[PDB]
Amino acid sequence: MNRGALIKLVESRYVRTDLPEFRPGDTVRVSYKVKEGNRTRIQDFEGIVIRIRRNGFNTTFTVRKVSYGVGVERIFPLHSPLIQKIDIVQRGRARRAKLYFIRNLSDREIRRKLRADRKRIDKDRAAERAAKEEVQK
């Protein structure tokens, strides 16, 4: 019986690793398997990450964005099968976990408040193009 964790983890075969890294304070767009009137499509969602609710499996995360004057927030399950392709677009200086303080000041001040983490920027662009050349030859 001393397996309480593994037991819950066993059911957790619904996992997925195709999903890239991403920490709070960086914009990112996700493809979602949205069902239309009856068919199926992929609604894209461009926006900054505000929260990442880590908790083993079913670890959610939120994204807020401006949309025709209105700021919308969407919470997504990480290992959600409906998540087609989550794509990175720009990363920035976190300096904090949950950053709701953006809600209060959505403006050019948010840009200068969220810098650009050149550290991860390099590691990303470098390891992307460099690993490409290695996989090629």
Partner: protein, 204 residues
């Protein structure tokens, strides 16, 4: 009338075909039959199902004889199941096919001497204008000289929870026999470790 003992192990959500679904993870380990009581020997049909293994030394009780009477490893717990004579010597999660709904009985969490507002979900009283004495009180309880008493079973603050409770019609989700696990429609009485029984519901 299917039946099987088990323990609440925890619960998370899965994905059916494309929609999210909260589900509780039950663990119905092999439960050896201990005594098939017929109406002849007693007065009703049922079966004693053992459960977890046990240190043979702890079971020095005459239970040792009761276990030998059927020749089985000393279990920790055992309960009956009304109107249910199966087969073989052990019941399994094989008994439940995904799609079938089940009744799960368990022991709710103990909230001890809970307040009336906490218990029956009363209303208490005003927080501002009135006296700062009856914020969470039941207020009145009866009439005048008539009846002059109190209706038995009247709702009043007291020990509550930690009792036999039975949720119903929980559809059996994916059942993995590879490990004796059993998923259900989430909400289920008892804490993560309590003994719960699973039976056939009454849809019709």
């Amino acid at each position: 009338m299917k039946g099987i003992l088990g323990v609440k192990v925890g619960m998370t959500r899965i994905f059916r075909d494309d929609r999210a679904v909260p589900v509780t993870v039950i663990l119905a380990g092999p439960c050896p039959v201990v005594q098939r009581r017929t109406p002849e020997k007693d007065g009703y049909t049922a079966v004693q199902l053992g459960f977890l293994p046990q240190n043979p030394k702890r079971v020095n009780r005459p239970l040792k004889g009761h276990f030998a009477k059927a020749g089985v490893e000393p279990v920790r717990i055992l309960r009956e199941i009304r109107d249910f004579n199966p087969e073989g010597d052990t019941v399994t999660v094989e008994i439940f096919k995904p799609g079938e709904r089940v009744d799960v009985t368990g022991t709710s969490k103990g909230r001890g001497f809970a307040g009336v507002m906490k218990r029956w979900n009363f209303a208490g009283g005003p927080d501002s204008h009135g006296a700062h004495k009856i914020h969470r009180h039941p207020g009145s309880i009866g009439n005048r000289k008539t009846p002059g008493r109190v209706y038995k079973g009247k709702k009043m603050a007291g020990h509550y929870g930690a009792e036999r409770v039975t949720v119903m019609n929980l559809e059996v989700v994916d059942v993995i026999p590879e490990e004796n696990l059993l998923l259900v429609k989430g909400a289920v009485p008892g804490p993560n470790g309590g003994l719960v029984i699973v039976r056939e519901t009454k849809k019709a």
